[PDB]
From Swiss-Prot, chain A:
The gene is TUBGCP2. Signal peptide: none annotated. It comes from Homo sapiens. Component of the gamma-tubulin ring complex (gTuRC) which mediates microtubule nucleation. The gTuRC regulates the minus-end nucleation of alpha-beta tubulin heterodimers that grow into microtubule protafilaments, a critical step in centrosome duplication and spindle formation. Plays a role in neuronal migration. The chain holds residues 388 to 516 of 902 of the full protein. Transmembrane segments: none annotated. It is found in: Cytoplasm, Cytoskeleton, Microtubule organizing center, Centrosome. Component of the gamma-tubulin ring complex (gTuRC) consisting of TUBGCP2, TUBGCP3, TUBGCP4, TUBGCP5 and TUBGCP6 and gamma-tubulin TUBG1 or TUBG2. TUBGCP2, TUBGCP3, TUBGCP4, TUBGCP5 and TUBGCP6 assemble in a 5:5:2:1:1 stoichiometry; each is associated with a gamma-tubulin, thereby arranging 14 gamma-tubulins in a helical manner. Gamma-tubulin at the first position is blocked by TUBGCP3 at the last position, allowing 13 protafilaments to grow into a microtubule. Ubiquitously expressed. Belongs to the TUBGCP family. It is linked to Cortical dysplasia, complex, with other brain malformations 15: An autosomal recessive disorder characterized by global developmental delay, variably impaired intellectual development, speech delay, facial dysmorphism, microcephaly, and varying degrees of cortical malformations including pachygyria, thin corpus callosum and subcortical band heterotopia. Most patients have generalized seizures. This is Gamma-tubulin complex component 2. The lineage of its organism: Eukaryota, Metazoa, Chordata, Craniata, Vertebrata.
UniProtKB/Swiss-Prot annotation, chain B:
It is found in: Cytoplasm, Cytoskeleton, Microtubule organizing center, Centrosome. Belongs to the TUBGCP family. Component of the gamma-tubulin ring complex (gTuRC) consisting of TUBGCP2, TUBGCP3, TUBGCP4, TUBGCP5 and TUBGCP6 and gamma-tubulin TUBG1 or TUBG2. TUBGCP2, TUBGCP3, TUBGCP4, TUBGCP5 and TUBGCP6 assemble in a 5:5:2:1:1 stoichiometry; each is associated with a gamma-tubulin, thereby arranging 14 gamma-tubulins in a helical manner. Gamma-tubulin at the first position is blocked by TUBGCP3 at the last position, allowing 13 protafilaments to grow into a microtubule. It comes from the Eukaryota. This is Gamma-tubulin complex component 3. Ubiquitously expressed. The chain holds residues 364 to 424 of 907 of the full protein. Component of the gamma-tubulin ring complex (gTuRC) which mediates microtubule nucleation. The gTuRC regulates the minus-end nucleation of alpha-beta tubulin heterodimers that grow into microtubule protafilaments, a critical step in centrosome duplication and spindle formation.
Length: 129, 61
């Protein structure tokens, strides 16, 4: 739950031994191009099934997307500070580790869309198509 | 205390941690030495984690 507090509010993980559900892969090599990995949801980020604790399963897919949106904003500027950043503690008898994950999960896509529709706009290229 | 077997779990874990930093290092100087205190900083138990979270802050002055 400290690798969880990094991956969801930023786009990085820190596990000395890989036991987290999300694992990043590198597909930015010299022989791998930007037009050869084409969209990074289908190859670059996978979900490892058996490192999921299975009580995060209800949000499991979503946990992959959260830091994945945030990371392609971080490569320009690494400040992806969120007002929803908070210490996450496992609670059973309560679902508060559901609320924080969805709270970050909506804000992440909002920030990436506001960045993407303003800088590197999708209106101009589609009009030109 | 059945010959002090509770007083080998308050020590013998500190000393075991400080016998790893005294085993892993071998003639290191400079930045590869602050990568050796860093070598045992990422541990699951908060006990050994909380000892070297202070040792790093000391050594990196």
């Amino acid at each position: 739950f400290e690798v969880l507090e990094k991956w969801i509010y930023r786009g990085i993980i820190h596990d000395p031994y890989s036991e987290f559900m999300v694992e990043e892969h590198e597909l930015r090599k010299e022989r791998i191009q930007e037009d050869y990995n084409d969209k990074y949801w289908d190859q670059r980020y996978t979900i490892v099934q058996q490192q999921i604790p299975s009580f995060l399963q209800k949000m499991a897919d979503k946990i992959l997307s959260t830091g994945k949106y945030l990371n392609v904003v971080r490569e320009c500027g690494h400040d992806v500070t969120c007002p929803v950043a908070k210490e996450i503690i496992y609670t059973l008898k309560e679902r508060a580790y559901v609320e924080q994950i969805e709270k970050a999960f909506n804000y992440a896509s909002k920030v990436l869309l506001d960045f993407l529709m303003e800088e590197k706009e999708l209106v101009a290229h589609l009009r030109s198509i | 205390l059945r010959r002090l077997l509770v007083w080998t779990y308050d020590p013998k874990i500190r000393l075991k941690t400080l016998a790893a930093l005294v085993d892993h290092c071998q003639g290191r100087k400079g930045g590869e030495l602050a990568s050796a205190v860093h070598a045992y900083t990422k541990t699951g138990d908060p006990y050994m984690r909380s000892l070297v979270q202070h040792i790093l802050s000391l050594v990196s002055h």
